[PDB]
Nucleic acid binder design. Structure first.
Ligand code: ZN
Ligand code: ZN
Lengths: 74, 74
DNA sequence: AAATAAGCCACTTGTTG
DNA sequence: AAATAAGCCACTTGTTG
């Protein structure tokens, strides 16, 4: 699945994790953006710094990202 | 929708809320079964005694019933 | 409206007496 | 296996600076 493709490219160093996502939600103290080789952001996925999982990101809602155990601790 | 049909029959007194669901989960101290006029249980739906909402019940998982605010307080 | 997320269910995997 | 539910996402409605 498309989830594992993204995670494989982070482990190889093809994708880098972006210092920060511009917003006001507490989730961004834990979750980060993913960058391709050309410095273009990977659309639709974010990275948890705590568990190192790749989670689906949709701008229409931040509830899945919110209730993810690593964010719910904040 | 089928959710509102069940709730309408509880408000009319056509459906009665059953004293208890046999199980070990804390959710059953708040959630109850629904009975038809002939005393046969309404399959697929449960009733919250606290908020009085009709929630979907599937025997394959109790997670939706679990994280419902009235149960999550226990 | 850009952003955030309550609050229901779907769904697969995992657990446990 | 009967029962319970972690733990991800879908999805519609509602909120708020
Ligand atoms: Zn995490
Ligand atoms: Zn309730």
């Amino acid at each position: 699945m498309d989830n594992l493709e993204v995670k494989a490219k982070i482990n190889q160093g093809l994708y880098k994790i972006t210092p920060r996502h511009k917003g006001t939600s507490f989730i961004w103290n834990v979750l980060a953006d993913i960058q391709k080789e050309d410095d273009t952001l990977v659309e639709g996925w974010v990275f948890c710094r705590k568990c190192e999982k790749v989670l689906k990101y949709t701008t229409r809602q931040t509830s899945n990202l919110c209730r993810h155990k690593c964010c719910a601790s904040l």
